[PDB]
From a paper:
HIV-1 capsid protein (CA) plays critical roles in both early and late stages of the viral replication cycle. CA consists of 231 amino acids that fold into two distinct domains, the N-terminal domain (CANTD) and the C-terminal domain (CACTD), connected by a short linker. Multiple copies of CA monomers assemble around the viral genome to form the characteristic cone-shaped structure of the mature HIV-1 capsid core. The core is composed of ∼200 hexamers and precisely 12 pentamers.
Residue numbers in the entry:
A (entry chain A), B (entry chain A), C (entry chain A), D (entry chain A), E (entry chain A), F (entry chain A): 1 to 3, 7 to 221
The structure:
Amino acid sequence: PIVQGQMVHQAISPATLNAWVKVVEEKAFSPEVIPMFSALSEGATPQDLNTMLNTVGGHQAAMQMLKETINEEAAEWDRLHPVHAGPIAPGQMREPRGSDIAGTTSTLQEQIGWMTHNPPIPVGEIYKRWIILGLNKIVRMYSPTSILDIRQGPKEPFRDYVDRFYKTLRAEQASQEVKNWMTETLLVQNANPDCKTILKALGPGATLEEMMTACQGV
Amino acid sequence: PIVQGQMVHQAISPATLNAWVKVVEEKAFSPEVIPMFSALSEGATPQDLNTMLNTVGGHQAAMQMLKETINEEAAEWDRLHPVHAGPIAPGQMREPRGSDIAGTTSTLQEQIGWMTHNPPIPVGEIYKRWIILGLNKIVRMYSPTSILDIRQGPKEPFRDYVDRFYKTLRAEQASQEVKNWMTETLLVQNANPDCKTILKALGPGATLEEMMTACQGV
Amino acid sequence: PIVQGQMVHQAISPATLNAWVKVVEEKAFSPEVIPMFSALSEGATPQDLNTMLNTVGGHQAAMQMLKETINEEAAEWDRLHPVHAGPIAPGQMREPRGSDIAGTTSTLQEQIGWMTHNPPIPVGEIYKRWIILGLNKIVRMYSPTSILDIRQGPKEPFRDYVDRFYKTLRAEQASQEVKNWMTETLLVQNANPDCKTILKALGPGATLEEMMTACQGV
Amino acid sequence: PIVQGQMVHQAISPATLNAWVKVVEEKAFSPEVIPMFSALSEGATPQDLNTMLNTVGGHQAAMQMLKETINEEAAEWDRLHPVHAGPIAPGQMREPRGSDIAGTTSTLQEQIGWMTHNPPIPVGEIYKRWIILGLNKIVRMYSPTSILDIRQGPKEPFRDYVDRFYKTLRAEQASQEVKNWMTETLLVQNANPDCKTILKALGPGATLEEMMTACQGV
Amino acid sequence: PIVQGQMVHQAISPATLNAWVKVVEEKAFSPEVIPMFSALSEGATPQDLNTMLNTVGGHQAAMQMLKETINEEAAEWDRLHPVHAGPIAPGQMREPRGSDIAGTTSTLQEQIGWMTHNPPIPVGEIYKRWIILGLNKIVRMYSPTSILDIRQGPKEPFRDYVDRFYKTLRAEQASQEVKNWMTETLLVQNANPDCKTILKALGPGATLEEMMTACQGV
Amino acid sequence: PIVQGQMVHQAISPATLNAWVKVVEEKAFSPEVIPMFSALSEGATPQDLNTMLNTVGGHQAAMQMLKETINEEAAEWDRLHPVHAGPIAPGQMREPRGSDIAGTTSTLQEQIGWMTHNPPIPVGEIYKRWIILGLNKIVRMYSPTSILDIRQGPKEPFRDYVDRFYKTLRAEQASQEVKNWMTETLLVQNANPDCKTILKALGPGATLEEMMTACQGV
Ligand SMILES: [Cl-]
Ligand SMILES: [Cl-]
Ligand SMILES: [Cl-]
Ligand SMILES: [Cl-]
Ligand SMILES: [Cl-]
Ligand SMILES: [Cl-]
Ligand SMILES: [Cl-]
Ligand SMILES: [Cl-]
Ligand SMILES: [Cl-]
Ligand SMILES: [Cl-]
Ligand SMILES: [Cl-]
Ligand SMILES: [Cl-]
Ligand SMILES: [Cl-]
Ligand SMILES: [Cl-]
Ligand SMILES: [Cl-]
Ligand SMILES: [Cl-]
Ligand SMILES: [Cl-]
Ligand SMILES: [Cl-]
Ligand SMILES: [Cl-]
Ligand SMILES: [Cl-]
Ligand SMILES: [Cl-]
Ligand SMILES: [Cl-]
Ligand SMILES: [Cl-]
Ligand SMILES: [Cl-]
Ligand SMILES: [Cl-]
Ligand SMILES: [Cl-]
Ligand SMILES: [Cl-]
Ligand SMILES: [Cl-]
Ligand SMILES: [Cl-]
Ligand SMILES: [Cl-]
Ligand SMILES: [Cl-]
Ligand SMILES: [Cl-]
Ligand SMILES: [Cl-]
Ligand SMILES: [Cl-]
Ligand SMILES: [Cl-]
Ligand SMILES: [Cl-]
Ligand SMILES: [Cl-]
Ligand SMILES: [Cl-]
Ligand SMILES: [Cl-]
Ligand SMILES: [Cl-]
Ligand SMILES: [Cl-]
Ligand SMILES: [Cl-]
């Protein structure tokens, strides 16, 4: 990663490596893995990101899907950023291609140069953006449940049902507005009869805290 | 987080991440989780706070309640701090909205800029204030006992009864004066007959040390 | 905590937090907990000390007693240091009250200012002094044995008896002179007959090493 | 390893040593060991690399093969870089031989000098290149399966079959084009009848995500 | 502890504290504890040394003996270094007493001042010298065996017998010359008949390596 | 150890101490212990090396042999470097004896002075050289097998036999040329009949990779 205020490079630490490896080993592709990854890769160069992706043993279907997503995003970057032929002048650096951002055709020194230039070319955060895109696609693909099937059991406490509902919702492919519709439409509709009656008695503008308080004793 | 004396940024450490994750995994929403959180987020940017909140897997009902609380506080901030339309001048930065403080519509560089400006705009400690508000609401909502039900058993040592009393009291929703009333009224009233007689013999102005010393042999 | 030689602030580390929490979890209020606390809080601000006290879950009777002790010491500080009304001038800081030293009515910046001023106002070491006072009161209150009841068994090796004696003595409420009297009077008196005869044969000015050597084979 | 921006030397850390040793102990010569090694040796001198190779106990057949590969690459370097006889002048350093790059005939100071000179002679990354070459040869030699034998079982979920396929493919000796041919030819051909029919119905240009989605319910 | 080259103070780390505590918990007063202590206290102030001694729970007989030894050494220091009455001048510091070196009557700032002055008054290494003296007395007092009782068994391999011999010898109270006599006299004398015959056949000037090689097959 | 580029001293870390202690506890005197030691002592002063040697509990026969080896090397250093009588001048330091290099008659400051002088007198790397000499003698003395007894079993896979062969060879006392002879003469000679026939069919100049590939299916 890159850290008076001058940005200087630093190698990836054993604690970071082991933390990432253990996270993948234990939690597979649960949603919370994506922020953890993003937490362990703050300020990372494309070389560091490739290091974290390549140290994963197993799950090679998901890693291959991630490669294909990264290749798509790189091809799009090349389509939007055509390269200009010509010799690079002193005081400048070559403009990066898709494969340079993905760390396969650029050196560590070139990545440091792009990331420390003024103005900065943040290849690390771009590559990280692509990687998180692919990881999201994997997380949704490996989710075992659908939000339309989350229904409160006859004896199920309301809190547990809401936990299942919002976990599944966190795994879903939907914009924020579609998720607001799922909350405002499905949550009360799929509650059990007693809880459903009480929640309908609350009103259309009830907060989650008010709903869980209403069905608390139930 | 942000640390000659110049404030410089630093990424969140694997030890911090793992510590927070394990705390949530082991202690759920016991009261002591709130200071621990506040301890692990000293000097954190809104991005770091969002990182710690998003790495929590499960408990998604509580995390959703936390989102709603944060949205309420952000809406209030917008009501009290209306934005002024106009182009930002050199040497200045845009004034933050509620969503900028919550880290969803502001970049890392903007947060660093607000937090390092003179005078400082401490978006991290404001967002942290909102988060701790919501966490308190969760802690009270998930408390299994009420202070009016804590009664000393016939053979229960006075120390254990006081432990239960002040744990439950720590989970309660009450100002400091209401808590002083609960201490001065309920503690002796709900003791067992022998201890209650002795404590009544102490007097109205007895310290906790004197009360536990009086009922020690009992 | 606060660390060319200029004192600069630093957040509390996860290793410190976890170390303190585990110490309290494992050893309750054994004597050796007090130096450990003092070791984990070197250079701590009142905010750090409050962090370490508040992260303790359970033992809330002892924590409440600690609060009452801290309030007493703060009230005494206010009685000895009356505040002077008037506007604070540039180049100065307000003089702290008892609640400012205890970290409940002062900010982090004010504590840093007091602790880095020339001459220094060491609010952290003062608050720490109060806290260690209360912790001592707790340690003595929770000690299960009295020094007058430590008596050597008929087959007990002298070393084990001395271990019990000086552990209990370490838990006792007594000045150093009272402890010298307890050593010079009770240790030999409460030994078993054979050891007692030998130690009486040593003389009044025998060192502990000489006494344990004399009763070694016994 | 070597780290205002001036490159300064630093000893290898116990966390790095232990991490590498445990990786070799647990995962033998699985593919993901090679990036991990490369991650634990960022900025390493030839002395550090020799340290990591020599701390491996057991697997001495593979370590001997690695020695032979390194000797071959060193001999090639000597063939391409003949040494010029003559006294080294002040302000210069001797040009390295193959054994100097491999760390057996050069001192720590000479390696630091080559790696910090302007222009730099990166003996560490060259030696690391040779080492990774030999490690790849070992990984392929110890792979238990061939890509032509990976066939989907009659009840096997498509995801597991793809996992096996791309793990074995990761262990294979083949350029990227040969691997694209293996993907485009063998993956669908060796699927089970139902999945094979569906994938043939997809078309020749199907992405891996589309293929796993098509055979998901199957 | 105290660490451009200017000596600056630093608090004691949780890893140091835990390491020392675990060492005492696991190995009691085996000889190797003394260097470990000395390793964990490099550059320590008397406050740090008192911290490490006071965090030991149990073994209070040995800790009391250590207190008595420290008091003896302090009294001797006072006898050899009489204090001169008079007001301390600007640019000077008071000369330390025995109790100042032992950290009971001096502050942290005074210890830092003595240890950083030119010329330096190394109170930390002096106090450490006293502490190691007392620790040696404890180690010898708690040793269960005597060197005159270490005799090779009839079937005992020579290596194990030498291990026992030199462990016991390491616990002994003897100067280096007395230990050379114990080696040159007792080691061969107390070997078993066969080994003893062979070693006598070696000669008076045999090295330990030659002796263990001679009795290796035996 | 000793680390703008100026060499400054630093105390030995708890992670280094614990790593070394655990290595000795778990692996005794296997060959790979020697590089590990050398890895944990990069830049160490003679005081640090003596610290690592003295913290070893048990194996006191081997530690005594190490003392005798160190004494021999020190005596040789004294024979080759006679001391010159005379008062040391300002701007100079006394030239070290054998016991000064071994850290028994020199202080920490003198070692720092020798190791930081220009030109440097590297007492740490010299002492380390002696220590590694003695450690090698111990490793060879405690090896349970001889290279002339390593013979492939009738059903033994060739890889396992080569592992045993090169482990035992790593423990052997032989120069590199003697080891090349052992490889070129004994490895094929002591293989089982089938493998031996195939390897003889390879030819005299076969690489280890070619030999293990030839006998792979066998
Ligand atoms: Cl995995
Ligand atoms: Cl998953
Ligand atoms: Cl890879
Ligand atoms: Cl850009
Ligand atoms: Cl961009
Ligand atoms: Cl479901
Ligand atoms: Cl509920
Ligand atoms: Cl959780
Ligand atoms: Cl909870
Ligand atoms: Cl998220
Ligand atoms: Cl503000
Ligand atoms: Cl504000
Ligand atoms: Cl209850
Ligand atoms: Cl009680
Ligand atoms: Cl606790
Ligand atoms: Cl207790
Ligand atoms: Cl609190
Ligand atoms: Cl003051
Ligand atoms: Cl004061
Ligand atoms: Cl008792
Ligand atoms: Cl005894
Ligand atoms: Cl291994
Ligand atoms: Cl393998
Ligand atoms: Cl080696
Ligand atoms: Cl080159
Ligand atoms: Cl090159
Ligand atoms: Cl297979
Ligand atoms: Cl599937
Ligand atoms: Cl202990
Ligand atoms: Cl012991
Ligand atoms: Cl104490
Ligand atoms: Cl002195
Ligand atoms: Cl002195
Ligand atoms: Cl014995
Ligand atoms: Cl033997
Ligand atoms: Cl050991
Ligand atoms: Cl061994
Ligand atoms: Cl020693
Ligand atoms: Cl020299
Ligand atoms: Cl030399
Ligand atoms: Cl054998
Ligand atoms: Cl084989």
